[PDB]
């Protein structure tokens, strides 16, 4: 056997965190078009038999809170876990509506000892956010 | 006994330290390319091969436009970080 067992009762979860509107105090601009991404993703993963859950405009606390609760669920009848994060960000950090959350923190909720029901199962994190401020000038 | 960081896959929209492009009406370059490829190949290719297709799509078909010379005509290349232990197929 050299491929992940995908024959479990259900394909798995698919949490999509779509952040468009941020708090004035943060100084972060609205992410126009992100709804199209949230909508597109919802359909695709739906057609892949995943249990999609859309969460819009979550605060840094609500993000951790959600990830904490999702890890405490029973995934024994699930094949995988997909987590999509659409938001602003920097290297190792994604923005909640009121402040930054370091990826490492929410990622830990699913690593081995924390989420035993997903052990040996693929935990996929798809991330649409900036990772710095460099610009690629292309060539040819 | 396996590593605690094993079986993780981070599909980033852009390379380390770079900006990531999004379009006001079309959505983000990465996501729209991601979904396109999934629809067409989720039942033919292994995940890593699908993501590679996305890399090519985003890197080839997309280039930015702005009135600000600094942010004009810029490119993007997604980044795949895999710590998966096996191959992944959606069937």
């Amino acid at each position: 056997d050299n491929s992940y067992k995908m024959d479990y009762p259900e394909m798995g979860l698919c949490i999509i965190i779509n952040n468009k509107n941020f708090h004035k105090s943060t100084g972060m601009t609205s992410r126009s078009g992100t709804d199209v991404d949230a909508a597109n993703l919802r359909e695709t993963f739906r057609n892949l038999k995943y249990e999609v859950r859309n969460k819009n405009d979550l605060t840094r606390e609500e993000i951790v809170e959600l990830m904490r609760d999702v890890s405490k669920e029973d995934h024994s009848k699930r094949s995988s876990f997909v987590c999509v994060l659409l938001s602003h960000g920097e290297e190792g950090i994604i923005f909640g509506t009121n402040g930054p959350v370091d990826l490492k923190k929410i990622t830990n909720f699913f690593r081995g000892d924390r989420c035993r029901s997903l052990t040996g199962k693929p935990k996929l994190f798809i991330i649409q956010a900036c990772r710095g401020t460099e610009l690629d000038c292309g060539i040819e | 006994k396996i590593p605690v960081e094993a079986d993780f896959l981070y599909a980033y929209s852009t390379a380390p330290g770079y900006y990531s492009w999004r379009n006001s009406k079309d959505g983000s370059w990465f996501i729209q390319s991601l979904c396109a490829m999934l629809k067409q190949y989720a039942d033919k290719l292994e995940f890593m091969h699908i993501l590679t297709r996305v890399n090519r799509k985003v890197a080839t078909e997309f280039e930015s436009f702005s009135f600000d010379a600094t942010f004009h005509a810029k490119k993007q290349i997604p980044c795949i970080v895999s710590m998966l232990t096996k191959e992944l197929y959606f069937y």
């Binding site: 602003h88 649409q128 956010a129 900036c130 | 990531s20 492009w21 436009f65 942010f71």
Partner: peptide, 4 residues
């Protein structure tokens, strides 16, 4: 086009 906008950045994230």
């Amino acid at each position: 086009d906008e950045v994230x």
